[PDB]
Amino acid sequence: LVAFIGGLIKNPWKPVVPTAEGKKAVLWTSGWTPRFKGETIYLARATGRES
Amino acid sequence: IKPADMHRVIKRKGQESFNFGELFAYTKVCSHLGCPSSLYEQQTYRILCPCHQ
Amino acid sequence: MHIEARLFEILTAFFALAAVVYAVLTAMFATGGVEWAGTTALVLTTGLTLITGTFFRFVARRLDTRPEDYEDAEISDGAGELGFFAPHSWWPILISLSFSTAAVGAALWLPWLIAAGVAFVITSVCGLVFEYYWGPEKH
Amino acid sequence: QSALLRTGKQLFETSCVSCHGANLQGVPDRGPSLIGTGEAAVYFQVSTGRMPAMRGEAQAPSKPPHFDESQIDALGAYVQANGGGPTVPRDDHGAVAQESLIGGDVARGGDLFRLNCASCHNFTGKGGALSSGKYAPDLGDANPAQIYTAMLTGPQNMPKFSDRQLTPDEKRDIVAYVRESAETPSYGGYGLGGFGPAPEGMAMWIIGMVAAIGVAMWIGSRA
Amino acid sequence: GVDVEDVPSAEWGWSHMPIGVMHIGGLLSAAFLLVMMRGNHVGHVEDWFLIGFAAVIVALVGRNWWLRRRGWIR
Amino acid sequence: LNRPNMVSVGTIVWLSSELMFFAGLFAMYFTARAQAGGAWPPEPTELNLALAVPVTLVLIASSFTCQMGVFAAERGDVFGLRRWYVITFLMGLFFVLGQGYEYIHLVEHGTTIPGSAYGSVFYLATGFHGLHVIGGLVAFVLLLARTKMSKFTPAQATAAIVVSYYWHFVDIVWIALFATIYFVR
Amino acid sequence: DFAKLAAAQGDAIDSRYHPSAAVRRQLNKVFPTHWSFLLGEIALYSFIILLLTGVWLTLFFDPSMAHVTYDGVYQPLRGVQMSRAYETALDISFEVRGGLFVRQVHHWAALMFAASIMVHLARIFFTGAFRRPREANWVIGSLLLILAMFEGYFGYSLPDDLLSGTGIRAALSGITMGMPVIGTWLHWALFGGDFPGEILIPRLYALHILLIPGIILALIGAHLALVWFQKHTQFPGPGRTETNVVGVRVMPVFAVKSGAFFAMITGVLGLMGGLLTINPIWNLGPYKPSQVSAGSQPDFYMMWTEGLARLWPAWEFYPFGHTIPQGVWVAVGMGLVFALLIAYPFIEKKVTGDDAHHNLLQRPRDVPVRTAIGSMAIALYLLLTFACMNDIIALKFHISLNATTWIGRIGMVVLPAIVYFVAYRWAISLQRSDREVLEHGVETGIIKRLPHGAYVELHQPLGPVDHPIPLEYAGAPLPKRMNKLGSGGAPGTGSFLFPDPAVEHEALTEAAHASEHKSLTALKEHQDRIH
Ligand SMILES: CCCCCCCCCCCCCCCC(=O)O[C@H](COC(=O)CCCCCCC[C@@H](C)CCCCCCCCC)COP(=O)(O)O[C@H]1[C@H](O)[C@H](O)[C@@H](O)[C@@H](O)[C@@H]1O
Ligand SMILES: CC(C)=CCC/C(C)=C/CC/C(C)=C/CC/C(C)=C/CC/C(C)=C/CC/C(C)=C/CC/C(C)=C/CC1=C(C)C(=O)c2ccccc2C1=O
Ligand code: HEC
Ligand code: HEC
Ligand code: HEM
Ligand code: FES
């Protein structure tokens, strides 16, 4: 049973997302999280179209 | 926000300086179950999530 | 049954006189000629009373006196069988609910609800009309 | 135009002053100010028939227009000249462009509608409910200029889509998608109102299940 | 818990619920309607609707309990 | 047979009330005929008096057949009643189809309920009469089914009599409305 | 020519497998002919449709979350970036002849499957067929109901469109994520990570075409095996007893009836799949986390869940550094409901102490408490279902959204109590009507005025008269109209337009009357002898 279910068990808190403060869990981060301590993140509208 | 209503803005502790004048930015993810709370009623300034109202 | 008829053509006579008087008094001495709404309604009120009175008069021309139309009648004269009166039925409430569904569908203009209410009306009227005529199940 | 402005003023003074103040500044607790709204706002309010209103409530509903096209143009000219703001796109002959507003790209109009608009009506603009008595109406019976001016001047609880937030080509794409979705027949059969699983379940319970139970009653026996 | 005079077909199936279940059910329903006044809403019309319905439920339970306690209702 | 039949008298009084309903519709029509100014019907309305006469004649024929079916049902012959009422049902259906066809041809020629006041009154009155005709057709179908489902008692004959009463009221109202619309104009 | 072939085939079959005794036992099995005993069969037949169409849909569906550009035939989505599952669903709807028809027949069959399972559950619950020895069969049925609900959920989640993707994100992600201790672990076991992952659709496809269908197939097999070898229940009647089954044998009445019902159900499903549109995916577009629609409702068998989440009032808990969100309530809600559905026979067995073998069903009026509870549960389910649809109700019927929300909130308390009270009184009143009929006789609707002025109604006694001797209630339905006892007579035989000669009418009517007397006499002799 352990060798069966164990392939599905994933730690949700394994730091996998880069951040200007190291590696952090997915649920703690989004695309707005800066990644090199001074990153310019623009608020971009979706034109719904190339670019 | 229309300036004629900017006096009505009450600001959260620790976020008093997150707006740039009349422009506020919030998440488009409902805090209940993650649906896009994407119904902006301007005359009531109400953000509405259609998944569970 | 002469009394009921006679009442109806009395109403007919008065209604016809009033309708003609209204038509004449509006054709001349009114602002825009005949009024065309009171006149129509009064003429067809005359028609309503006329139809009812004429049918009752044709019934009275074809009827020997009943106990209830006969003074000095004795209860024993009226003895016998009266007819069929429904002992119980729950179809009227269903017919009313169906017509209410249709009315709501046509108040808030929803053609699908109108069609559903109309189908429900046909079904409940069928149930009411067929209630004492459905035979025993075949099996 | 002097005649046009005078006709607009003589229409406004007998249809709008009781709520808008007779100098286009609002009546305190009847109506808002009318400075800056412009010809586009006037056209969308009157040509839709929403305006004049009659009751102060959660939302003013759409009605048959209370004037004609020329009178709507006169009122738009009046409110525009007294204030100043957005205008309706005109055509080569002085009217408002209807076919010219129909955009080419309908996939892009659909993407823009789903990102900006479908959140309040639905996927195909069939309408949706709002917080307190308000709602976003069904878009089917609205000509292109009304759609364009509703985007351009958000009336009430509609976000305002300026010409730089939604460019004219984007607005025309959205207009094209809305008209296409209104005018497209359902392919799978009878579209059950275009709302999804709710009419589908009602149809199953009232047609499929009713017919199935009736057939079972026919085949089976009582007692 | 019932007689043939009250429920004719009593021998045929489950036909009685103890009145305690109904009384505590009414009290709990009233408590739920009351506790729904704590939450997130600006307006207070719904609070008065909840109070009115809770009052009706408590009045019904109180009358039923009183009449069974005095003997009229059984 | 020394007493009156109450289903008949109830049907008669209710038919008189329905006559009053059509009185309301006639009052709607006559007004706005006097406001047009003589251009009645106004353009682009051109009454198709070549299809309206045939449906009127078919309605009169259906009334005759319905009375013949009443004659059949008065002597207890359920099958003759069924035949005459099926014929009446088919011819009333033809009348409804002709009315719909004239509706279609008129709407195609710019005459609609929102289009004009004449259109408003004309379609209102004629459509309500058509709804009454459709109700009569439903009554015919229900009566035929009831005759199919039980032995033909005098109660069935009474039901057929009152259904024919309703049909006679309907086509008399249509005669009046045809004379008012396509003749007086 | 075929008689010799039949005889030779039967001889070969008997010489090789000797099935004669068993086949004869299965052909002589007696099934009662009540209409409600057909309800379960609907859930069977639709399921078979769900298999058939399902296999068809497996020949064209690619359940990949990989993102591609459409370049299909549907113009209003040309150049739109979508998942591979959405594109293949579009290809089914537009590029395969009859693909739209198969999709719609499949979705309609799913809806009928759910609805017929619900109606069959209502029949089983109100008739008391869950009683001993049929408790495990109720457990199996409840498991089948839950499995069908989740199977349909996964099914319409398969094409990754805006509506189904929004439903996935709301329910299967938000509720799972918020569970107290293992919620995020469950979410990352199921999705393989965060919600907008890459493995969800293939996993749901595998669960939905193979795993859940296999479990449901095995459970339906065990279910029908139990029903077959635990012979069907029956209602109390003339010839009925706890120790017998009265009905028709399998060959040929029951087999032909079941086959014809299958054909008619297939006809209804085909007509609905052709003439009615269901799930027009191409109008919704590909799923995008940044977009949503106003009309966000699942298929109806899940709607109640959303209604619960719409009505429960934002009650959250904050223990030491931890959050227990509102969605947890919803989960518990569902759990409790499912629990309360699985163990109902044992709950009633404990409460009433009734642990006796039961083969004769109960009329719902004879069990007012259980009927009241069932009406209460149905009222609550309907209220939650409509509270799920309160945005559409608000839009179409002019009512504010907050009004429908508060009506639902107050109703989920007030309405079940009113419905319980009304159902209880209504059941007892139906009992009283039965007793009135049994004690005075059927009211014929005929009124006579006696010579002294007495208006009396003619009563038709159902038994002998001394005024009738009052008969004893025997758990069976009673006639209350005289046309149902044969008083309405028979119409003249013919073709609805032309009569047959009176000799044929006499022969047929006399033969039918003789047959009816013979059948009633046979039932009377069997009843008298056995008792
Ligand atoms: C099984 C019977 C089904 C027969 C199907 C067999 C027919 C064969 C071919 C079918 C082809 C499809 C039919 C026409 C193709 C078609 O779809 O036609 C729609 C029309 O729909 C309507 O309303 C018309 C309603 C009249 C239909 C009445 C039948 C409905 C039944 C099925 C409902 C019974 C269940 C009742 C439920 C409740 C009962 C319980 C209380 C467009 O209406 P539209 O005028 O453009 O407005 C819309 C708006 O949503 C909006 O205005 C929008 O702006 C527009 O874009 C358009 O969507
Ligand atoms: C929750 C609540 C209180 C709602 C009240 C709104 C309402 C119906 C008010 C009516 C006024 C009242 C209260 C009248 C009382 C008198 C009575 C008893 C009337 C009975 C008739 C009623 C209540 C009818 C309403 C039935 C009803 C609400 C059904 C649910 C609505 C549903 C499921 C709509 C689904 C549905 C939609 C939305 C379509 O667009 C569509 C388009 C094309 C074909 C089919 C459909 C379809 O089925
Ligand atoms: C009182 C019943 C009013 C009458 C008379 C007129 N208007 Fe109005 N208007 C009124 C309200 C309460 C509102 C805002 C809320 C709403 O339901 O719309 C408005 C709004 C407008 C607007 C839009 C303003 C904006 O910022 O978008 C316009 C352009 C407008 N009103 C014009 C207008 C015209 C032309 C009128 C005469 C036909 C008129 N209003 C009358 C209230 C009332
Ligand atoms: C918030 C919810 C929105 C958003 C994001 C959009 N719309 Fe709509 N809309 C909304 C409301 C409350 C109203 C009512 C207008 C009023 O009460 O004065 C409308 C109206 C429209 C209309 C007019 C429909 C008609 O009168 O026939 C149209 C054509 C329309 N809305 C379209 C539309 C488009 C194209 C949008 C995306 C740019 C869009 N809406 C968004 C509410 C809301
Ligand atoms: C109780 C059994 C089942 C239920 C309730 C059910 C329900 C559904 C529903 C509602 C859909 C949505 C279809 C649409 O919206 O277009 C769906 C999709 C699908 N079903 Fe099923 N299904 C069942 C069994 C099966 C089986 C047994 C198979 C395969 C043998 C299958 C194959 C599919 C496939 C491949 C899809 C996705 C393709 C598409 O959506 O067009 N289903 N299912
Ligand atoms: S996800 Fe927004 S309210 Fe539920």
Shape of chain E: elongated
Percent in helix of chain E: 55-70%
Compute the number of helices of chain E. 2
Number of strands of chain E: 0
Greatest contact between two chains? D-G, 58 and 68 residues
Cα-to-Cα separation, first versus last residue of chain E = 11 Å
Put simply, the count of helices of chain D is 8
Share of helix among residues of chain D?
40-55%
Query: Into which percentage range does the β-strand content of chain D fall?
Result: under 5%
Radius of gyration of chain E: 17 Å
PDB class: oxidoreductase
Keywords: membrane protein, inhibitor complex, mycobacterium, cytochrome bc, oxidoreductase
Entry title: Mycobacterial cytochrome bc1:aa3 with inhibitor
Chains A, B: Cytochrome bc1 complex Rieske iron-sulfur subunit
Describe the structure.
This is part of a larger assembly, with two copies of chain A, one copy of chain C (139 residues), one copy of chain D (223 residues), one copy of chain E (74 residues), one copy of chain F (185 residues) and one copy of chain G (531 residues). Chain A is largely without helices or strands. In chain A, 8% of the residues lie in helices and 12% in strands. In chain A, a hairpin with a 2-residue loop joins strand 1 and strand 2. Chain A is elongated. By secondary structure, chain F is mostly helical. Chain F has a single domain (6-182), classed as Four Helix Bundle (Hemerythrin (Met), subunit A) (Up-down Bundle), CATH 1.20.120.80. Chain F has helices at 6-30, 52-74, 78-108, 117-149, 154-184. The N and C termini of chain F lie far apart (47 Å). Chain G has helices at residues 2-17, 20-27, 39-58, 84-95, 99-127, 135-157, 162-177, 183-190, 200-229, 250-275, 300-311, 327-342, 344-352, 368-388, 390-396, 401-440, 502-530; strands at 30-31, 67-69, 81-83, 248-249, 442-449, 455-460. In chain G, helix 4 (84-95) packs across helix 5, helix 5 packs across helix 10 and helix 14 runs antiparallel to helix 16. The chains are: A little secondary structure (51), C mainly alpha (139), D mainly alpha (223), E mainly alpha (74), F mainly alpha (185), G mainly alpha (531). Chains in contact: A-D, A-G, B-D, B-G, C-D, C-F, C-G, D-G, E-G, F-G. The interface between A and D is small, with 5 and 6 residues. Protoporphyrin IX containing FE binds next to helix 3, helix 4, helix 5, helix 6 and helix 9 of chain G. Chain A: Belongs to the Rieske iron-sulfur protein family. Chain A: This is Cytochrome bc1 complex Rieske iron-sulfur subunit. Chain A: It is found in: Cell membrane.
